[PDB]
Design a protein around this ligand. Structure first.
Ligand SMILES: N[C@@H](CCC(=O)O)C(=O)O
Ligand SMILES: N[C@@H](CCCC[NH3+])C(=O)O
Ligand SMILES: N[C@@H](CCCC[NH3+])C(=O)O
Ligand SMILES: N[C@@H](CC(=O)O)C(=O)O
Length: 583
């Protein structure tokens, strides 16, 4: 019949005396004196349905079968619950359905886990369709739909064009390994899943599309970490006849509509800091600006200290307020914490209430060091100053990571705060030995590789110095950071055949090694390529921030575990011999 005519969660006291038929799942069942009470849940909410005197004896034969998560279709009459049965916590607090008919649409076996007691990672993914029935995962998936519509609304206001790009095509370098697809009608040759639609969106700018956008699917065989899985989603954008200012301006407008979905007006324009300044003050190119605790350089301070472990190219410091009152277990635990990061340890010097500098670092001072150490790093009586020495990037990152953990233990991060920042003027190159050490795939066999991608253009001031001082080259790129998370990054592109070949030659791509890999793109630059640039947002992390979830898998409908394991579909699985033949 009519499986559903009303919504369960929308009923009210003014809808009483109405013959309705509902459809949904049984949230709970409780028998009280022979009367069966059920909580009927659909996508709109929960309403209570009761069974009274046997209007039909066949109904009670089925009503006694009802259990948790039974999918049913109930027809009754909305009435007012008797005095003493009102639920001020539920929306439908004073209403119940006196059922007359009842149909079991889908019997439910005893659940692997109840919807109120959450389970582990493997169990929630193996039964994700049951996990998605919970309140928080459902609202997270439905929010991601409004996030897409919010981004499409901004770009549609600016005459952008939604264009789908091939996913079975050529390799695109982004710093990771490619996912391969065997060509059936071409034995030995392999397609490649796109690490990004970077190449196709630059060709679309040569095509005169001017303004392009796409919510694309990107595939990167990375080490399972951070804000994306092997298969993740981006908000891809690209414009022509624009500079970095134009792309930042439209990116801030997209973020404004996104965070407006949760009721937070972003202060436009978002502040910007340079790459060299960002790592100088915070130790990372993606800093958290919800708290202070900035790094204090002490290299000049220890130019006369006889401590050999501080006779290094860099000396950093982070002051923990009130950190001298920590027990020995908390201080010794910081050494085991710093040991897992990749350093010899996090040396510190406590400050007594009387101002005396104490700790293992205090005995190494040079009197004049003990005089100014508390005043140089901005330490108060009772503070704790964690020091980091050694190479610049190693000590900056070790202190930049130690800076964040101090905010966690001291309860310094306000969870309701939002700290956006642009990180501009990054380096365009970095040593290939430092990238492959972090598990990244190098562009070429040379001593350099791209910091974003090889198609990033240098600033016009450093265009003449791609070959000379390679490391000093500043990039025309920009990354947007939110609460210590990188949620997006872009750059102005190279649109000349000769400059793209110079950048390729620096990274170790031979003059023929580019024609074989990117000969189509270099060819397109000979046919009136416009100045263009763009940006791509990590859509999984952006949605997880808007939803308040720290794990990005909470905003993916059917995510995988760490390592590509799929508990739901048991993928990947081997193939037959007949299937393997076409390879
Ligand atoms: N808010 C969800 C479920 C109700 C709830 O959060 O308790 C909805 O719109 O149906
Ligand atoms: N006709 C709807 C039910 C009534 C409207 C519920 N929102 C359906 O079959 O899904
Ligand atoms: N986006 C284009 C116009 C798109 C609509 C053209 N009929 C521009 O800014 O020039
Ligand atoms: N293609 C870049 C984004 C961009 O440069 O526009 C990425 O995937 O991170």
């Amino acid at each position: 019949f009519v499986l559903r005519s009303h919504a369960a969660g929308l009923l009210r006291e003014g809808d009483a005396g109405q013959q309705v038929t509902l459809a949904g799942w049984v949230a709970r069942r409780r028998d009280h004196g022979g009367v069966i009470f059920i909580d009927l849940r659909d996508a709109s909410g929960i309403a209570q349905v009761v069974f009274r005197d046997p209007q039909d004896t066949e109904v009670l034969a089925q009503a006694h079968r009802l259990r948790a998560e039974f999918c049913v279709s109930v027809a009754g009459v909305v009435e007012i619950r008797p005095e003493g049965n009102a639920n001020p916590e539920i929306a439908t607090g004073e209403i119940e359905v006196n059922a007359t008919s009842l149909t079991v649409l889908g019997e439910c076996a005893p659940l692997p886990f109840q919807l109120d007691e959450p389970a582990g990672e493997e169990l929630r993914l193996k039964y994700r369709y049951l996990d998605l029935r919970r309140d928080d995962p459902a609202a997270a998936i439905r929010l991601r739909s409004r996030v897409n519509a919010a981004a499409r609304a901004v770009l549609a206001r600016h005459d952008f064009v939604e264009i789908e790009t091939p996913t079975i095509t050529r390799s695109t370098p982004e710093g990771a390994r490619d996912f391969l697809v065997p060509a059936r009608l071409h034995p030995g040759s392999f397609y490649a899943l796109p690490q990004s639609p970077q190449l196709f969106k630059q060709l679309l700018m040569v095509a005169g599309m001017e303004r392009y956008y796409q919510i694309a699917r990107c595939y990167r065989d990375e080490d399972f970490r951070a804000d994306r899985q092997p298969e993740f989603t981006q908000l891809d954008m690209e414009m022509s006849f624009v500079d970095a200012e134009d792309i930042i301006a439209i990116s801030e407008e997209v973020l404004t509509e996104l965070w407006a979905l949760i009721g937070y007006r972003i202060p436009t324009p978002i502040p910007r800091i340079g790459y060299a300044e960002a790592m100088r003050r915070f130790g990372t190119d993606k800093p958290d600006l919800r708290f202070g605790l900035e790094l204090v350089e002490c290299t000049d301070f220890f130019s006369d200290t006889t401590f050999r472990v501080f006779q290094a190219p860099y000396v950093g410091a982070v002051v923990m307020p009130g950190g001298a009152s920590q027990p020995r277990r908390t201080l010794d635990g910081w050494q085991d914490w710093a040991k897992q990061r990749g350093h010899r340890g996090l040396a510190y010097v406590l400050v007594a209430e009387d101002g005396t500098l104490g700790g293992p670092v205090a005995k190494n001072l040079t009197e004049a060091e003990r005089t100014g150490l508390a005043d140089h790093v901005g330490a108060k009586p009772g503070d704790c100053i964690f020091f980091s020495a050694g190479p610049v990037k190693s000590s900056r990152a070790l202190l930049g990571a130690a800076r964040v953990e101090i905010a966690n233990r001291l309860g310094l991060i306000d969870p309701d705060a939002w700290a956006f920042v642009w990180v501009v003027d990054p380096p365009l190159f970095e040593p290939a030995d430092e990238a492959t050490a972090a598990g990244e795939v190098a562009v070429g066999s040379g001593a350099w590789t791209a910091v974003h991608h090889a198609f990033t253009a240098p600033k016009p001031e450093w265009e003449d110095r791609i070959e000379s001082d390679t490391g000093s080259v500043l990039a025309d790129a920009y990354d947007i950071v939110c609460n210590g998370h990188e949620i997006g990054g872009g750059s102005v592109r190279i649109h000349r055949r000769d400059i793209q070949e110079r950048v390729f030659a620096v990274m170790g791509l031979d003059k023929a090694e580019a024609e074989e890999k990117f000969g189509f793109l270099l060819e397109a630059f000979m046919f009136g390529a416009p100045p263009h640039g763009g940006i791509a947002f990590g859509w999984d992390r952006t949605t997880a921030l808007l939803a308040g979830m720290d794990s990005i898998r909470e905003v993916i409908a059917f995510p995988k575990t760490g390592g590509g394991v799929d508990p739901l579909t048991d993928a990947p699985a081997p193939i037959t011999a007949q299937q393997r033949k076409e390879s």
